[PDB]
Symmetry: C3
């Protein structure tokens, strides 16, 4: 009882740590994407599909993140 409570709370707490890390990593990722796009632009045709997949994965990540924020509990 006291055991299981401390265990599950600890588990729940680290889930919030992992999620917060994932969100920060995503913010970092979007910054790198911008940097690349700006470099391709200083030297963007032929990168249409590349742009599309990025948008695809980015949308999915943002969806999953939002879906995780609501699933999240702070015990």
């Amino acid at each position: 009882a006291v055991q299981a409570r401390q265990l599950l709370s600890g588990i729940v707490q680290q889930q919030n740590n992992l999620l917060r890390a994932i969100e920060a990593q995503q913010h970092l990722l979007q910054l790198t994407v911008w940097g690349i796009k700006q470099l391709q632009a200083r030297i963007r045709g032929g990168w249409e599909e590349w742009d599309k997949k990025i948008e695809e994965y980015t949308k999915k990540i943002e969806e999953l993140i939002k879906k995780s924020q609501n699933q999240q509990i702070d015990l």
Copy 2:
């Protein structure tokens, strides 16, 4: 009992969402790697980046291993 199941399942669901996000972030990261690599090629060659290339291969392999590892461990309650 009812409390335990709901709390546990909720935790299991949360983990599957975190994993899915990690996978999509990995797919996203590999796209940026290529993007950089193609820029480096467009500007002596890609010489001097052999070690850089190495660590990427190292971490990429490790991530993919850990992901597959997490897929086989993951449960869909």
Copy 3:
């Protein structure tokens, strides 16, 4: 009882896998940051990317803090 332990241990092992993947992705991410910065420096100066650099740093430190914070909370059953 036997059910709960096996289920809770499985969950904890999964968290360990997810965390390790996040650390490896972070290593990979920092490699991409370097690659970009070196291309920016090889093509006026890196002026105008001050704010960009600052946010990279901001999120990077936050990630590393969150990672270390998760390594402590981490248990191996």
